[PDB]
Design a protein around this nucleic acid. Structure first.
Lengths: 53, 194, 159, 69, 248, 116, 246
RNA sequence: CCUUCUCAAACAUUCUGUUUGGUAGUGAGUGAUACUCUUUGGAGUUAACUUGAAAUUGCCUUAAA
């Protein structure tokens, strides 16, 4: 089970902007539109870091 | 000793007294450990560098970060009545208690080691004045902000549900549920009191 | 002979106030089936190749309105008088008076239908508003409370 | 006699939490777009800008054909 | 019939813009003509053209005499014209809506042209649009049988052209068009000879399509005509040629 | 009881005695009208008095215009008690010898820093 | 030209008068009152004379507004062409490089539809302190943003050149906003003879720097205007005769 | 149920600077010592603050029916 094209490209935007600051990442408004928790974003980034860098 | 204010602008006055006083080690005392999640989460998001202490976090997480205040010079923490009990720092000048305390009797005894004022609509030292048109107009900023994030809406809610429970679970005949809920919701800035 | 909670209707909002109510309400149309569909195809053509805030509209379901009053989220509530089962809406002016949400009985059910992309609506409400029309809305609230509520304080009485 | 309603209400009649679906921009329309993305990925549907281009080449070529021979 | 209170304030406040609008323009071109620049907005003549993506080429205006055809429009909403605009529109006798006239643009004409800008639309026409206007619409106020002159009726003849003007070399209706397209000396006499041009209105009806075509076209005026309301407002020029296809 | 002079208040900006006289002519014959204006600049303080000649006709108007929403804000209108006439709302519109004293005043002023 | 030493004896004796055992404005507001034989007597202007100043009092005003109660905020009024063109991120990228920060840019539209209420307009305007306005619409504003907003010297706008010879460019505004911010001081022009120059924050203006600001102003006033008398005044002090023309 | 002056010039250009001109207000009310003026009549001014857009009287036609 992989992730979608938009999801991957959206995660690229978050990683390049903040890095690994999940608190800043979920208090962000422009990139993290759907106000997901720290646990949601980091889990999806771990899956992203497996397929990519 | 105290400052007489209505329940609408109790929080709005506090944000004034923090912004005007940004050099001194000052402590607020609030009731609920749930509540000081809320007033900490606003002030870092309306950008005051505050600190936060409450029961809902770990011990050395509480301790080592409380340790940062004790060796500091400038800033400010927000803590409960309970978690700060027994651990007074002599390096402090303002103890403002927002709430009626847990024990009102034994509260005066814990002063004498630190200048004091409180906040009360109907409910030694003197008061202070306040020029009423000086409070910050952030309530326009906050009402948009309490509607936009849902995390800040949830923590506003628990900061309200837990505020009044503790207000009812108190000792005194004076501080018993007379206060109108139209204005305590405005201290957490709602349109409707949840 | 009519029991007072029936014929709390028919003592409806007058000519000029009703006109001004629709001057406000016709600004806040729900996006129609055609308009909504074409917008999403615009979104499909754009987002597939290469942000928006919450848009305000009127709220128009009977269940949705009876939710919104007592939520409390409703500010103005329009209520049609002509309803096939009258008992569907008889409690609604009392609910608004009890929760303190400003209401107005409007005349014509199809008149509500026009502003809402439906045949009939029976009830229509405006929960939230754009900032420019906020002062105008609150003025209409006072206008309706002066004309409708204060004139007909005795509407709960008299058969 | 409007007896009970004279005492005007304060908190809403429920206490239900309000979900995150009433804040971040909505899934439904976001799902619906993704389907219309899917259909143009499969090409079942033309975008509206090319439909004008389908109507630009068409509808000028009117009455411009032989009918007797 | 009864007047609603909405009306009389809307009429008040719109005209008391126009009473304020032309006052400022009448003060300005006074100070432009009398040449007392210590505090002015702008120091020259502006003519803007609006055509088609919706281009706005603002230009200067030299002294070169040009030819303008001006159509009366009925705008804006609640505006009783003041005394200062009753006059110019009566001196151009454009008191009927959807009625046109050719005039010449000089530096005497341009300052008064900023007065009537919200009430009409102006522009430079083409020779076809000069010609196809006159040979298709034309009124001649001339004597009837014996008594009744003011039957304005029709440019039927070329010998009625011999009758009134005649001695200025004015021999045929095509010769009139020479006197308008080219600035001739007897241009004002033949301009005084063809008093209106009763253009039709575009929408011209109530109905199914007619309600919709009115609404769809009414917003089109709001783009192709903007009301500047400025002290040194430009004079806005539209293409007459595309307009006359809508009006002939 | 109620008298003839009316208290039309809360008037829209851009609504003067003429339109006050014009619109309230529609109810019947009207005695005399003013509108209270600022003296310094000729603009309105948004309350004005008029009188009908018929005391019947007054409370016709008050029972028709007491909360009549009119381009922004509803007119509040009042019949008045007996007597208490319309009075005084005037129609206002937009309406080295020195060097001796300044040499005196320049030297007088320096005493003030010595004062405080 | 005025002597440096009377101004030093002017400012420091007011440091005395401000060091005594509303207060946010009385202590803090260095102002200097200027008189004329009839400033601009017959025409009610609203322009702001942007007096060139060597050393800013706004980067000073930037800090102490964080320590005091009211937030110093900067407005830009634009026409329709630019707001559709330019974001705050482009401003922030080329002004935080100094450290100045446009809080809100506001269209000409927004003054008339979403702040058209007098209450909300006073709520919107009275927050801000540096009102800047693009030149195309500067001349339309007292219908828009009210007359009450022109009673102050903060809230009255400043015309600022944003067009690079007839066309807008961001480069033009970005160095011009710095030009008005750190180098310029406004003063209005009543048609009376009295005029003050609210010079600024007395907590700032290290009073050797303050004399540098005062003397530089007196250069740009005596050259541009005839003048009669000049006075420095902490807010309703005894007035101090600094300069005395005849 | 109207919707409000959305830039002119001049010189010099770095891909924009310098200079000049252009803005006549909702109303009410509070109020901090100074400035000028003429003449005792008050006039023009100068900080600041409040306020639901508040208020009880200063001597043209087709936007037709």
């Amino acid at each position: 089970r992989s992730q979608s094209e938009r999801e991957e490209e959206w995660l690229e935007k978050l990683y390049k902007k903040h890095g690994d600051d999940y608190k800043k990442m979920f208090f962000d408004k422009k990139l993290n539109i759907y106000q997901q928790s720290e646990g949601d974003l980091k889990r999806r980034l771990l899956r992203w870091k497996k397929r990519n860098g | 000793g105290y400052v007489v204010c209505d329940s609408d602008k109790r929080f709005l006055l506090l944000f004034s007294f923090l912004k005007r006083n940004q050099k001194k080690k000052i402590i607020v005392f609030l009731s609920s450990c749930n509540s000081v999640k809320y007033y900490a989460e606003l002030l870092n998001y309306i950008d005051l560098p505050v600190l936060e202490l409450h029961g809902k976090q770990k011990q050395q997480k509480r301790t080592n970060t409380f340790f940062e205040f004790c060796n500091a010079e400038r800033g400010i923490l927000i803590c409960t009545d309970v978690a700060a009990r027994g651990l007074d720092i002599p390096a402090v000048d303002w103890i403002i208690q927002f709430d009626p305390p847990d024990d009102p009797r034994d509260y005066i005894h814990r002063v004498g080691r630190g200048k004091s004022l409180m906040f009360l609509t109907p409910n030694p030292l003197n008061e202070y004045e306040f020029p009423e048109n000086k409070i910050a107009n952030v309530q326009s900023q906050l009402e948009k902000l309490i509607k936009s994030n849902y995390y800040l809406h949830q923590t506003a809610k628990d900061g309200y549900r837990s505020y009044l429970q503790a207000y009812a679970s108190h000792s005194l005949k004076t501080v018993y549920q007379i206060d109108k809920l139209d204005l305590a919701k405005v201290a957490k800035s709602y349109g409707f009191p949840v | 002979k009519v029991p007072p909670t029936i014929a709390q209707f028919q003592y409806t909002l007058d000519r000029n106030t009703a006109a001004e109510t629709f001057k406000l309400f016709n600004k806040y149309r729900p996006e129609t089936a055609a308009e909504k569909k074409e917008r999403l195809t615009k979104e499909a053509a754009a987002v597939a190749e290469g942000a928006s805030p919450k848009p305000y509209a009127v709220k128009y379901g009977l269940n949705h309105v009876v939710a919104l009053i007592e939520n409390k989220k409703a500010k103005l509530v329009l209520i049609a008088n002509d309803v096939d089962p009258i008992e569907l809406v008889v409690f609604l002016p009392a609910l608004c008076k009890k929760m303190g949400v400003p209401y107005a009985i409007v005349k014509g059910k199809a008149r509500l239908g026009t502003l809402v992309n439906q045949k009939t609506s029976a009830v229509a409400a405006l929960t939230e508003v754009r900032a420019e029309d906020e002062a105008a809305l609150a003025k209409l609230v006072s206008t309706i409370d002066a004309n409708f509520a204060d004139k007909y304080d005795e509407v709960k009485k008299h058969w | 006699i409007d007896w009970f309603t004279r005492h005007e209400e304060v908190m809403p009649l429920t206490a239900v939490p309000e979900p995150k679906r009433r804040f971040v921009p909505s899934k439904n329309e976001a799902k619906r777009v993704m389907k219309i993305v899917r259909a143009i990925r499969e090409g079942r549907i033309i975008p509206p800008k090319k439909l004008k281009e389908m109507k630009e080449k068409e509808k000028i070529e009117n009455y411009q054909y032989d009918l007797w021979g | 019939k009864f007047v609603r209170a909405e009306s009389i304030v809307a009429k008040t406040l719109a005209t008391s813009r126009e009473k304020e609008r032309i006052k400022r323009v009448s003060i300005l071109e006074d100070k432009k003509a009398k040449n007392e620049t210590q505090h002015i907005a702008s120091g020259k003549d502006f003519i803007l053209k609006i055509t088609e993506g919706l281009i706005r080429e603002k230009t200067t205006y030299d002294g070169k005499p040009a030819l303008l055809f001006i159509v009366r429009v009925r705008g804006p909403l609640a505006v009783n014209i003041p005394n200062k605009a009753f006059k110019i529109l009566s001196l151009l006798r454009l008191v009927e809506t959807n009625t046109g006239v050719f005039v010449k643009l000089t530096k005497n004409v341009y300052p008064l042209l900023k007065v009537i800008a919200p009430y009409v639309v102006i522009g430079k026409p083409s020779l076809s649009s000069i010609r196809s206007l006159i040979q298709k619409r034309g009124r001649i106020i001339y004597k009837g049988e014996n008594e009744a002159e003011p039957h304005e009726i029709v440019l039927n003849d070329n010998n009625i052209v011999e009758e009134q003007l005649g001695d200025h070399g004015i021999i045929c209706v095509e010769d009139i068009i020479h006197e308008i397209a080219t600035m001739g000396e007897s241009f004002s006499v033949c301009n005084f000879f063809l008093q209106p041009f009763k253009l039709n209105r575009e929408v011209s009806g109530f109905g199914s399509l007619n309600r919709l075509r009115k609404i769809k076209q009414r917003e089109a005026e709001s783009r192709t005509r903007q009301f500047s309301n400025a002290a040194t407002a430009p004079v806005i020029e539209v293409d007459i040629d595309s307009l006359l296809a809508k009006l002939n | 009881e109620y008298s003839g002079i009316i208290y039309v208040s809360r008037l829209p900006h851009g609504f003067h005695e003429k339109e006050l006289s014009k619109y309230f002519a529609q109810f019947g014959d009207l005695k005399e009208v003013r509108l209270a204006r600022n003296k310094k600049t000729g603009n309105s303080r948004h309350y004005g008095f008029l009188e009908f000649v018929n005391k019947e006709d007054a409370m016709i108007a008050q029972e028709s215009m007491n909360n009549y929403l009119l381009m922004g804000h509803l007119l509040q209108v009042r019949v008045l008690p007996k007597g208490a006439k319309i009075e005084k709302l005037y129609k206002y519109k937009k309406r080295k010898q020195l060097k001796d004293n300044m040499k005196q005043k320049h030297e007088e002023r320096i005493k003030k820093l010595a004062k405080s | 030209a005025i002597p440096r030493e009377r101004v030093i004896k002017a400012v420091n004796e007011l440091i005395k008068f401000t060091s005594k055992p509303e207060e946010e404005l009385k202590k803090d507001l260095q102002l200097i009152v200027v008189n004329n034989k009839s400033f601009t007597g017959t025409s009610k202007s609203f322009k702001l004379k942007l007096l060139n100043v060597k050393h800013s009092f706004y980067k000073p005003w930037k800090e102490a507004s964080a320590t005091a109660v009211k937030d110093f905020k900067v407005l830009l009024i634009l026409k329709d062409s630019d707001i559709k063109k330019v974001s705050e991120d482009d401003l922030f990228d080329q002004l935080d490089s100094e450290g100045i920060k446009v809080d809100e840019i506001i269209c000409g539209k927004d003054l008339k539809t979403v702040y058209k209420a007098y209450e909300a307009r006073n709520a919107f305007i009275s927050q801000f302190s540096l009102i800047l306005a693009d030149d195309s619409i500067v001349t339309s504003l007292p219908k828009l943003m009210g007359g009450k907003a022109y009673n102050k010297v903060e809230t009255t706008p400043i015309s600022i050149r944003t067009h690079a010879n007839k066309e807008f460019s961001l480069t033009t505004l970005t160095n011009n906003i710095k030009k008005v911010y750190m180098n310029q001081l406004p003063v209005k022009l009543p048609r009376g003879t009295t005029l003050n120059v609210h010079l600024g924050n007395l907590e700032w203006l290290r009073p050797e720097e303050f004399v540098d600001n005062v003397e530089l102003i007196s250069e740009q006033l005596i050259k541009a205007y005839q003048i009669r008398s000049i006075f420095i005044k902490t807010n309703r002090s005894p007035v101090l005769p600094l300069y005395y023309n005849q």
